[PDB]
A paper describes a structure:
The aminoacyl-[name] synthetases (aaRSs) are essential enzymes playing a central role in the translation of the genetic code and hence constitute a viable target for the development of antibiotics. Based on the structure of the catalytic site, two distinct classes of [name] synthetases can be discerned. Both classes activate an amino acid in forming the respective aminoacyl-adenylate (aa-AMP) as natural reaction intermediates. In view of their resemblance and irrespective of the class, aminoacyl-sulfamoyl adenosine (aaSA) derivatives are well-known high-affinity aaRS inhibitors, but they lack antibacterial activity due to their low uptake potential. Structural analysis showed the flipped 2-hydroxymethyl-1,3-dideazaadenine base is partially mimicking the interactions of adenine within both series of aaRS enzymes.
The compound was unambiguously built inside the active site of [name] synthetase according to the electron density map, which confirmed the conformation of the flipped base. With the present modification, in most cases, the amine group occupies the place where the N3 of adenine is normally residing and mimics its interaction with the protein. In this work, the flipped base loses part of these important interactions, providing a good rationale for their lower activity compared with aaSA. However, in the case of SerRS, the base moiety adopts the syn-conformation relative to the ribose defined by the torsion angle (O4′-C1′-N7-C8) of −124°, while the base bound in the active site of class I LeuRS and [name] and class II AspRS remains in the anti-conformation. In the case of the class I-targeting compounds, low-nanomolar Kiapp were obtained for the 7HMDDA derivatives 32e–f and 1.2 µM for 32b targeting [name]. While these values reflect high affinity for the target enzymes, the inhibition is 5 to 420-fold lower compared to that with the original aaSA analogue. While [name] was about 400 times less inhibitory compared to TyrSA, the 3DA and the uracil analogue only gave 10-fold and 15-fold reductions in activity, respectively, while the cytosine congener also suffered a 400-fold decreased inhibitory activity.
Author numbering:
A (entry chain A): 5 to 235, 243 to 424
B (entry chain B): 5 to 238, 242 to 289, 291 to 293, 297 to 424
Amino acid sequence: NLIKQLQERGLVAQVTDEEALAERLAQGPIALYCGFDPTADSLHLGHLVPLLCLKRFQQAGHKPVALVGGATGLIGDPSFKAAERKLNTEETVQEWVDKIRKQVAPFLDFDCGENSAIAANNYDWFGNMNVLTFLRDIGKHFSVNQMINKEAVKQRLNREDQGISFTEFSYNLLQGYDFACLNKQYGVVLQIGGSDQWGNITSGIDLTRRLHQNQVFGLTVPLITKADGTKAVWLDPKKTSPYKFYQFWINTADADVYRFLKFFTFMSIEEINALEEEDKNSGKAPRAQYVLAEQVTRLVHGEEGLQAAKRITECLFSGSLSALSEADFEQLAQDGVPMVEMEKGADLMQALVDSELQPSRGQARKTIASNAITINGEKQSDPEYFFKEEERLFGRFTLLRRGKKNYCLICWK
Amino acid sequence: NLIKQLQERGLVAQVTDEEALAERLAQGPIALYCGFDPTADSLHLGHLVPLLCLKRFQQAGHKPVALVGGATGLIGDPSFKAAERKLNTEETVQEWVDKIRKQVAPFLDFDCGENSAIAANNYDWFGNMNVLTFLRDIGKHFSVNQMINKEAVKQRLNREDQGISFTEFSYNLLQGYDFACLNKQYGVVLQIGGSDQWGNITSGIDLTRRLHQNQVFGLTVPLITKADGTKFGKGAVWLDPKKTSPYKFYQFWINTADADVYRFLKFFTFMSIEEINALEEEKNSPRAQYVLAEQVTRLVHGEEGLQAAKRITECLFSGSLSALSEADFEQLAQDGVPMVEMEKGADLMQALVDSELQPSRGQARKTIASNAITINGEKQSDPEYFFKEEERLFGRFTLLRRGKKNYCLICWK
Ligand SMILES: Nc1cc(CO)cc2ncn([C@@H]3O[C@H](COS(=O)(=O)NC(=O)[C@@H](N)Cc4ccc(O)cc4)[C@@H](O)[C@H]3O)c12
Ligand SMILES: Nc1cc(CO)cc2ncn([C@@H]3O[C@H](COS(=O)(=O)NC(=O)[C@@H](N)Cc4ccc(O)cc4)[C@@H](O)[C@H]3O)c12
Ligand code: NA
Ligand code: NA
C-alpha cells in the first residue's frame, strides 16, 4: 500500500476514507494535486514536504498536478495564521507566480507518459467568474456556522483587533472550488498538503460532491515540530546560498536526522533504517547528518551546488582559501559568515575592532601577539601588521578568524 | 427642519450624526435613496412606509432614488429572518423586478426638474463584477468579527440547523457597496429604510468612507407593532389589486383599531400633523378610520378604486346590488365574500348546502321557510324555489345572504 509506505516514513497526518482511497490506488493510476500560493519570491524548505510527496506519488504511477495560486494569492490564506496579511498587487503576484512555477517544475517529471505532471493556475477560472455566480453557485453550499468554527480560523474570531477580513474568510471557498475544477478538468480525485490545509481540503471534497457528484479524497502531510520544540531557508540560491543550505542540514539534531531523511530525501526506508542502525551500534557520533546534507543539497542545488557547499565548508575549516572562487566568496558574503565593509589600508588591529570581533585596539594587541588571529588561514602573530596586497583575494576578500570558530569576512570597498 | 417634522409623525427610528444631517438638509437639496428587494411579484403595505418617506423627502425639495435589487434579490437579505430562504431563479427575479419597478414609479415625481426621481437597479454593477475584484476592493473593508455581531444575524449564528449560508452572510456587503456606488454616481448622501435595515445601512456608511472618503448618513423608519402586540399586516395586504382587491384593501383600513388609527394616518398619509391631531380631538360625537381608508385607497388604487370599494361596501351593507358592475362582482369573487361555484339548475336548498350556509337540505328548508335568505338582496321564503335566469346577474353571479350578515357569492359554471 502506497499509503502504508508513506505512513512508515511519517508522511501521513490524516486521510479521508482511507480504505476507499487505498482501493482506488491499488486499482490503478489516479490523478492528485497540491497547491502553492505565491506569497514570496521563492518557496522554502517547508514547501518541499508536500512537493516531494507529489513526486513520491508519481513514482508509484500516479499523476501529480502542481497548482500555483494565481487567484488565491490575491486573497490570502488565513489558515492557522495569527494576523491578517496585507493584500499584494496583481503585478507582484504575477511575477511571483512565474518564479514559483519555474522553481516547482524540476521536482516533478513532465515527460513520463500518461502520469506526466501538470502545472495549473486557479486564476484560469477565478479571473472570469462573476461575484453573483460565486455567491450563489458556490456560497450556498457553505454554512457560516460551520466555517467560523474551523480550527484554521477559530482563534481569529476571538478578539477583533486580531480579527479576519471577509476577504480572508472567503479563501476557504476558493480553494474548495479548485478541487472541483481539477476534478472536472483532469479527473483529480486526491488533494494533499500539510495538515494546516485540512479544512481547505475537506471543503473541496464536499463541494466537489455537491457540484460534480463525484467522490474525491484528501491526505495531509505533517508540519514538522523538532524534537526539542521549535520550527527561513529558501530554495532560491540568491536568498539562501547552497553553502548555508548545506550547513543547515549538517547541524540537524540527532533526534531529528532520521525523520528528516524520511521527509526530505528519496532514500529507501531500508537504507534509512540501516543508517540509523549503523549509527546506533557504531561507537561513534552519528554520520547521518552528512548523508542528509549531501542528499537534499544535491536535490535542490544539484551536484555543482553540493560541491561548492563542500568546497567552502572545506576551505573555511582548513584555512586554505586557494580553492575558493570569486563566486564561492560571494556566498560567504551573502550568507555563510558575518561580514563587514572596510576601506583598504587598515591594519589587522582595526580590522578586529570594526567587525565586533575584538572590543578594543589594546585587546587586539594582545590577541594578535598571542597568535590567535588568522588571516585567510595563515597565522599572523605581530600587532603592527598590515595586509599585503596579495592577501586580498580576488581584489576584495579577506577572511578574519579569532580562535577556531569566530569568523568575519571583510568585503573591502 | 425636515427631520424634526418626521419625528413628530413618529417616522424616525434612528439617525446617524443627526445634527450634521439636519444642517445638510437645511442647506439645500440632497440626493437620498431606499432599496426594495424583489421577493414577490408585488409590494405590500409594509413597503409603503419607507416608500412614502421617499416622497416626503421629495416634497421638501430633495432627490429620491428608488432602487430595486435585481442583484441582491438573487442573494437574499437574511436580516431578522428566522430561516434561510430558497434561491430564486434569474428568470423569475427579473419578472418581479419589472413589476416592482412599475409599482413604485407612480409614487414619485420623475419629471420635476433637478430633484426628479431616479430608478436604479444594483444588477447594473453587480451583474458583471468579477469575484476577485469584489473580495479585494470591497470585502477587505469588512471585519467578520463585526459582521457576526450585527443584530440582524445574531439569531442565525448559534446553531447550524437554523444557520446562515455564506450566500446570505455576504448580503450585507452588497448593500454596503450600493450606498458607496450611489454616492459616487449621483451624490447620494442619505439612505433610508426600516429599522431592520440599520446594520445594512451603517455598513454602507462605513464603506463609503473607506472607498470614497465621503461622509454619508442613515435614517431608519420604525416597524409597526400594533397596540395589541401583533405584528402589522398579518395574510398580507398587497398593493396589486389582482392579489388584494381594492374593496378588501379599503376594508382593512376601515377596521383599524382606534389605538392605531392616528399612528397609521401619520405613517400612511400626507395629511398634515396639525390636522391629524385635530381629528384625534374627536370629542364631539370617529371619522379617522374613514379618512384613513379614503386616503390610502385613493393613494394606491386611484379615485376609481376608491369609488369601487365604497360602492361595494354600501351595496353589501344595504343589500341593493343594482349599483354593482361586473368588475365589482369580480372583486367579490376574488376575495370580498365567500364564493362557491355551482352548475346552473341547482335549487336554493342545494346552494345553501354547497355554500355551507346550511348543513343539510332538511335544515335549509326550515331556514328558507323562516324568511332568513335573500337572493341578490330580495327575500325568498319558498323552500322549494329554483333560481330564475334573471337572478344570475351578467349570466354568472348570484349573491346569497343568510340572516343579516352571512354572504356567499354563487359563481355559476
Ligand atoms: N507541509 C509543510 C511543512 C512545513 C514544516 O513544518 C512547513 C510548511 N510550510 C508550508 N507547507 C505546506 O506547503 C503547501 C503550500 O503552502 S502555502 O503556499 O502556504 N499553501 C497555501 O496557502 C494553500 N492555501 C495553497 C492552495 C491554493 C489553492 C489550492 O487549490 C490548493 C492549495 C501547503 O500544503 C502547506 O501545508 C509546509
Ligand atoms: N419599513 C417597514 C415597515 C413595516 C411595518 O411593520 C413593514 C415592512 N416591510 C418592509 N419594510 C421596509 O421596506 C423596505 C424594503 O423591504 S425589503 O425589500 O425586505 N428590503 C430589503 O430586503 C433590503 N435589503 C433592500 C435593499 C437592497 C439594496 C440596497 O442598496 C438597499 C436596500 C425596507 O426598508 C424594509 O424595512 C417595512
Ligand atoms: Na497546499
Ligand atoms: Na430598504
